Amino acid sequence: LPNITILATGGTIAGGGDSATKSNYTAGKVGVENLVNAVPQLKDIANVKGEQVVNIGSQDMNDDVWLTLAKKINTDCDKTDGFVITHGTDTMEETAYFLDLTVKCDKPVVMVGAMRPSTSMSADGPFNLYNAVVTAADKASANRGVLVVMNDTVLDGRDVTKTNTTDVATFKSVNYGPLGYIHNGKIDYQRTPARKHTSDTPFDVSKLNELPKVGIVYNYANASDLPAKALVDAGYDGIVSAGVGNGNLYKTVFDTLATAAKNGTAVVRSSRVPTGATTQDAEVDDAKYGFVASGTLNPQKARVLLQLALTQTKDPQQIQQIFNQY
Amino acid sequence: LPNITILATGGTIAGGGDSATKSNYTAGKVGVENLVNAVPQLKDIANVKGEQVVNIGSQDMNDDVWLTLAKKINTDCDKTDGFVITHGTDTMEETAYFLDLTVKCDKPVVMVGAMRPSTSMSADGPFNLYNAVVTAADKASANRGVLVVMNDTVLDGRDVTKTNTTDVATFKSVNYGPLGYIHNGKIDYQRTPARKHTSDTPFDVSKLNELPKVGIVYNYANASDLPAKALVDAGYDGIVSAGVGNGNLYKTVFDTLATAAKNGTAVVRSSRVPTGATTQDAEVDDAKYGFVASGTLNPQKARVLLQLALTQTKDPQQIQQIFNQY
Amino acid sequence: LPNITILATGGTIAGGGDSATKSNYTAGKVGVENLVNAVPQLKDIANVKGEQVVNIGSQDMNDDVWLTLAKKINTDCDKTDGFVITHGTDTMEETAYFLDLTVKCDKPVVMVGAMRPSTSMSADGPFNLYNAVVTAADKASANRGVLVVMNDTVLDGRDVTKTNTTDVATFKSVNYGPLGYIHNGKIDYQRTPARKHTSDTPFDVSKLNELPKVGIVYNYANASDLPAKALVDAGYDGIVSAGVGNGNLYKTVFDTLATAAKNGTAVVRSSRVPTGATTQDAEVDDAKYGFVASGTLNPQKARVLLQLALTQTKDPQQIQQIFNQY
Amino acid sequence: LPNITILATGGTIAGGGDSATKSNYTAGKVGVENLVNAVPQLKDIANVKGEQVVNIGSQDMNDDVWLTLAKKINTDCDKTDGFVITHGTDTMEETAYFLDLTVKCDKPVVMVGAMRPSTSMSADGPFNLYNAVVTAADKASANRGVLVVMNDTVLDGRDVTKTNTTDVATFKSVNYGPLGYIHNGKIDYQRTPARKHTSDTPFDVSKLNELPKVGIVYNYANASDLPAKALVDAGYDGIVSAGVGNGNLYKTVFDTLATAAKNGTAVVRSSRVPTGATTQDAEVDDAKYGFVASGTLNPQKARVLLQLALTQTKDPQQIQQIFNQY
Numbered sequence A, B, C, D: 001l002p003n004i005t006i007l008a009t010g011g012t013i014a015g016g017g018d019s020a021t022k023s024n025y026t027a028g029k030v031g032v033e034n035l036v037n038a039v040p041q042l043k044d045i046a047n048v049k050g051e052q053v054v055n056i057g058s059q060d061m062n063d064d065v066w067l068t069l070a071k072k073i074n075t076d077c078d079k080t081d082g083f084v085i086t087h088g089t090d091t092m093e094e095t096a097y098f099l100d101l102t103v104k105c106d107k108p109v110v111m112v113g114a115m116r117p118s119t120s121m122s123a124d125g126p127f128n129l130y131n132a133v134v135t136a137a138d139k140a141s142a143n144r145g146v147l148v149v150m151n152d153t154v155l156d157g158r159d160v161t162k163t164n165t166t167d168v169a170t171f172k173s174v175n176y177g178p179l180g181y182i183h184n185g186k187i188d189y190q191r192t193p194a195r196k197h198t199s200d201t202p203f204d205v206s207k208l209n210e211l212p213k214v215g216i217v218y219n220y221a222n223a224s225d226l227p228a229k230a231l232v233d234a235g236y237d238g239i240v241s242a243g244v245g246n247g248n249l250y251k252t253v254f255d256t257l258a259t260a261a262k263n264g265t266a267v268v269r270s271s272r273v274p275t276g277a278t279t280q281d282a283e284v285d286d287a288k289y290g291f292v293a294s295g296t297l298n299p300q301k302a303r304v305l306l307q308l309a310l311t312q313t314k315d316p317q318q319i320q321q322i323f324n325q326y
């Protein structure tokens, strides 16, 4: 049986409430070996080893843990046959894309969480964690970039996103679809991500202890330019605009980010709209203002790429190319 | 034939590019009578009169235009049999909910836009505008609150939202579904919004020239508390948190909004997640920090209600009740 | 606590299997007592009387079980506070609609099943049962017709359909959306069905012990009319066509059915297309051939309403108006 | 500019109607020249040779037109740069899959239709045609199999299906997502089909002028096996079952088909459920009865692959492996 290392970071998959019937719970309580012992059938499909990296609710995920996960996955890559990362659902779509771009290891990395706590009735963590190692063990899962496995479905780390606040079926690749479906511990893979990932990227965080500062501003009717200017005043390396519609900006935010871009801040236009690309050649003349168009990357995903792009260049057209390739 | 007044504000429905084949265009160019003359079959179903309120791209929509629209709709209510508001798609879901809560007139108000410019091949504006007056003319459309009509579908102004950056079918009531479908100028209505609206609300903006200041902060891995503190320092009456998952907050943003709430700022927890409620009784003790849980209201919709709630009270539990009722 | 009668008919919620990690299992085998005992937390919210009606896979469901269920509910209506029906998921949408038209009890009737069998890992049946009882217990669930509660969602019996072959979240009201969502044992209702149901229908199943025979025929490329004739030589009271697109029929099947509509057998146009209404005034002149267009009712749900409409009149224009109101 | 052959078979893209505001219309009436002339902007991107193959409503589509289309494409393959096929939307998913398995040309084959007829307001056919030609013209569209381009989206022939009866956005690859989106006449491809298509299949339609007879039977509550026997006494080479749930069959239909699978006629288990795979190792022992599980192929698409698999072998275990690879 393959060697599968589990890397625990926290989440509701490791959370607990005082009742199987009530909704109140605290996140990231359960230790990693407790998670594994709850699913004794893991011994049938893999030889599992658990390591605790952190134990937090993923609403507190940060640059520090991202670097830690990437380096540990890269350096211990030949010690095991695959990795499963237990993680909170709240930001798992951010971590999954960050590792998608910084993991040089060639063996499958699968992220899992749970939408119901360990203690809840019909908790989903157990079958989720099982199906994650079924995926990390499958040699067919290799060469697909970093994966997210939830609700009997394998999802690529670029497009996967949390679509619903409470539903067990919340995670979807809302733009390009899942890579394959899990039935009875077997996977029928019919897709792979075309965008470049893992060792195919030039992002090397192995010597990095920081990440460039990138923030996100929201656009809406009558939006304040103060969030944008606060990030400008703090000397942020990049700002991601969660625009309206096809990446559009309220006029005052427009004015602020246009000025920051000419004075050196990298500005990426994404959108609050849950599906579809922020394109070029719509209402905003990106070439003129040195803006970068995020494509199908939502704001928090656009932040992941813009941070890593900023470790390579500060030229907007170089960054636009990175946003067209990864 | 019924009297239908069209109130034009701008949008891509009134936008133009130099080619039916290229995607570049400027928004809010076309005058309101030009829109009507493009659809001469309007004369078959209604006696239409057009008035120009503004001509902007709805990414620039603001409190000023909202007040103007509400007052004009309220005071001219008995002059016509129905209203159709042509409007940009980018923020139409915000205007539609604002009018949903401030319109005292009892006759149908229908908002329309277009995802392709007037000049584009297979432009959608014409049939959209037609189907909007078909809806404003139908007496069955009354008593349903303010409506949004797009792609042969009637949508309630609370739940309707822009789901895709470019698709003609972008607008959906992603939580509770549409009220009815349009076929051949007839509507088969099978639903109506349970939440209270229009004259059933206590919101009266008829003497108001301002709206309370409410901003929106985004949550993500490693999020800066600077947007939140900038809005605090400006003395904002309310802040809407676009949380992660079920309304959760990054720890530093948490700290800032908890403090603002105890010192008088109204704080509403919404979510970046495109569907589903930000509930109470999950990970955040709302009663303790005087936070308000937004339910199914997304951040920009939660801003609309919190602004209007702030014209009635500053007590968090009074505001939570408003968020449970409207 | 309220008195809740659980009526058990089988399903994979009562389904077996030799292993929590394998899919091979048998359906409709566990009894209602073992189902109730498996969820002891029912004892705190409701007073559940388990009654076994039959114990079958719902793929083998039929008119008999339908009739007995409708009778049993109407008879026992005033000796309980609500009903829960445990059912297989394959045909749950048809039973739910049948009872949605036949039951005359004005108290909640809620159906529930499970997509994973009792013995599987992370099995969904227990929380499903719990939430179904919560809904049957809720005062607000009355007067909304027969309900289906699955995956934390309350779905009206008319529009609810099985959307996916294996997903725990398979049930959706794909046309008009759900009625409300269940969180922490509380429901927030924001919709009710507009079509007449339960108590305001004219159907009366009380005396009948057999139901007019209606079959279903599938349109496709190079469709054979052998199934369509097979049902008319056997003298079926009516046929429902699973047409292509907007309820259109192939060459052969069109002719066989146009013969039939004139010589007695009432035929109904529905569609194999999972969402959207079969409209009249499209390609097919229903008035010319005496056809009936089903609207949003899919084929298995069109058969339910025709069977029953055939117990009232065989006039096509009489039937169409029942399809426009129920 | 590239040479693009447009092959016209009809559809509501060639459909009539007396009024832009009414739905009554007739299908497959406009010729290919009037279709091309209606989109003069084609002249700038492609060199379109219009060829009329037939002019029919695709509800009346059949094997003949399929065979002639496959032959015509394979024969003329090297006298053009790509093919566009204008088609009705009702059966477009079946033709697209047939050709996806039969054509041996390694140049783009793209199908297109319209949900609104040529003469309607805001008719979608022109931009649809334009974008289909864009896709047929694109160098990157080769080696992805037969494509369907509808509503600015490139969809693989296998998974694409008509999702809604009237929506202009009805076509979706409901299981694995689309291949790419078209904006401003450029496509961003991020997926290709993994299942073997076009040139790497073993099918050869060149000599054949008739196709093994396969019918489809619909499972539901109290299902009649009269359609299922009708096809076996008429000696059909195989039947596809539109089963309930995960490809399950009613009492009667199970027995008739278990008889059949043994006495020659190969039967295939598919499902009436719009999304998700009919799996083996569930409730039905396919190995015991010599059944075949279709996977994600819906019924009309299972019939396409069986018809063709029946021109190769009648062994069930031979057929299942073709269903696991094509």
Ligand SMILES: N[C@@H](CC(=O)O)C(=O)O
Residues within 6 Å of the ligand: A010, A011, A012, A013, A027, A028, A056, A057, A058, A059, A087, A088, A089, A090, A091, A113, A114, A115, A116, B245, B248, B283
């Ligand atoms: N707040 C939790 C939510 C979850 O895990 O589902 C987390 O992300 O850790």
Ligand SMILES: N[C@@H](CC(=O)O)C(=O)O
Residues within 6 Å of the ligand: A245, A248, A283, B010, B011, B012, B013, B027, B028, B056, B057, B058, B059, B087, B088, B089, B090, B091, B113, B114, B115, B116
């Ligand atoms: N930016 C435009 C987009 C549209 O109308 O579709 C607007 O909202 O006015």
Ligand SMILES: N[C@@H](CC(=O)O)C(=O)O
Residues within 6 Å of the ligand: C010, C011, C012, C013, C027, C028, C056, C057, C058, C059, C087, C088, C089, C090, C091, C113, C114, C115, C116, D245, D248, D283
């Ligand atoms: N075959 C099962 C399907 C299920 O319950 O999930 C039934 O309907 O009984």
Ligand SMILES: N[C@@H](CC(=O)O)C(=O)O
Residues within 6 Å of the ligand: C245, C248, C283, D010, D011, D012, D013, D027, D028, D056, D057, D058, D059, D087, D088, D089, D090, D091, D113, D114, D115, D116
């Ligand atoms: N009945 C039409 C449907 C369409 O094209 O929209 C056809 O398939 O030809």
